[PDB]
From a paper:
LSD1 demethylation favors interaction between ACE2 and importin-α, a key nuclear shuttling protein, increasing RNA Pol-II-coupled ACE2 in the nucleus of SARS-CoV-2-infected cells.
We also explored potential mechanisms of LSD1-mediated ACE2 nuclear translocation in silico. In addition to the N-terminal demethylation domain identified above, we also identified a high score (prediction cut off of 0.7 out of 1), highly conserved demethylation domain within the cytoplasmic tail of ACE2 harboring a high-affinity, highly conserved nuclear localization sequence (NLS) using both the previously mentioned bioinformatics tool from Wen et al. to identify the de-methylation domain (TGIRDRKKKNKRS) and the NLS prediction tool NLStradamus59 to identify the NLS within this motif (RKKKNK). Moreover, to assess whether LSD1 regulates the demethylation of ACE2 in the NLS domain, ACE2 peptides di-methylated at either lysine 769(PEP1), 770 (PEP2), 771 (PEP3) or double di-methylated at lysine 769 and 771 (PEP4) within the NLS motif were constructed and used as substrates for in vitro LSD1 activity assays. Recombinant LSD1 showed the greatest demethylation of the double di-methylated ACE2 peptide (PEP4) followed by PEP3, PEP2, and PEP1. We hypothesized that ACE2 demethylation by LSD1 surrounding the NLS or targeting the triple lysine motif comprising the NLS may influence interactions between ACE2 and the importin-α shuttling protein to translocate into the nucleus following SARS-CoV-2 infection. To examine the structural basis for any interaction between ACE2 and importin-α, we crystallized the cytoplasmic tail of ACE2 with importin-α. The structure, resolved at 2.2 Å, revealed ACE2 lysine residues forming important interactions with importin-α, and a direct, micromolar interaction was confirmed in both MST and FP assays. The interaction between importin-α and ACE2 c-terminal domain was further confirmed using an electrophoretic mobility shift assay. Examination of the interaction interface suggested that lysine methylation would cause steric clashes and severely impact the interaction between ACE2 and importin-α and its capacity to shuttle cargo to the nucleus.
Residue numbers in the entry:
A (entry chain B): 768 to 774
B (entry chain A): 72 to 495
Amino acid sequence: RKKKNKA
Amino acid sequence: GTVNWSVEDIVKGINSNNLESQLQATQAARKLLSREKQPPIDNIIRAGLIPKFVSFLGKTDCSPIQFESAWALTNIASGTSEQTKAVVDGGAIPAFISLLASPHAHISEQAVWALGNIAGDGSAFRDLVIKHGAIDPLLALLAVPDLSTLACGYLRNLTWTLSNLCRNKNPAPPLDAVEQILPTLVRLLHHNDPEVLADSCWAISYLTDGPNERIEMVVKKGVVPQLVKLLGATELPIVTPALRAIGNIVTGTDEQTQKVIDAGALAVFPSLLTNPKTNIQKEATWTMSNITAGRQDQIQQVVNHGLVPFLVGVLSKADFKTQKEAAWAITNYTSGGTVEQIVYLVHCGIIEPLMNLLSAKDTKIIQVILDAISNIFQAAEKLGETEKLSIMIEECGGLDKIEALQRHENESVYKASLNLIEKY
């Protein structure tokens, strides 16, 4: 939601 | 090649001063940090690697290490508040802002993403990102004649990061930052990509979640009709933030609510008030409750759009939170409405579901329903039709529940119930 991991 | 390195080997590579060795180890760290099962963020932090990644951000002469360290730091900053803080403490913010203008699109996209994570931590880091001057280069990335020429992932990431700059309260974002961002937001709200639309509506919903002056900043840009259009969309990730924005807007003045009505919003509510997703129904009913707290002409437009039977329906059968919002809508209606409007509400069948809700274990909804019924009784007094209403209440089992509410824990509940049976 607020933060996004880049996989 | 660079797959499943140990943190020890990564440290050994980064602490050589062979630039290629450092790049290899940095990519190994990036791959470690981009695995789905428990990426060892805290191990990377404890090894002291963040200042090295941050310094790699400035190596203009070797674009790959810029990219790999930007990605690694992005994933560290995506974690807990303490992990994001470790990224910020390393001086990452100005270095990422510097990368925003890089000639390599994947590098500047990575910087956009990282700044999105940092700003998304909360108000303090959001405002710190703003103070370091991120807004101008971010918006400059979108200063093109047609947004469709930008890569879709790039545009989505920019929209998401802008929405995070629009997010959070206590305090809300700085007024001048909101003013600077809003025109680009308005343009993104007209783009054709569903994810861009969803994140733009989210940004607008954040900006309208506050006092009437914030709502006014948004409403003056003329976005309400586009919000209504998106309220009619088929994609739930678009309808949800669009509906939240519309509800926020109708928490404002009667004139802002009127702008929502003029744009045609009420014609969407037959669908929204029967929507199979519980949260849509709840938020649509809350929006309706804030519309029925408006003027009598606005209540009348609610009537004309045929929405009172839908309120009766939601009161009769819905998730309990939605039913509470419906009770609020009814009490607002009865407190603000004319006598003929309250008569019409009774003729649509509000009394029996209103009574049935009096057997709930929620004290606030009991108070709300009792206030609504006393308002209805007041209108009936003006018409001299009070005992027809009392017979209607008694034939559906309402008098039993109101009389039982006399022996109730809450003092206000007992007082209102005793008043009702003493008077009628």
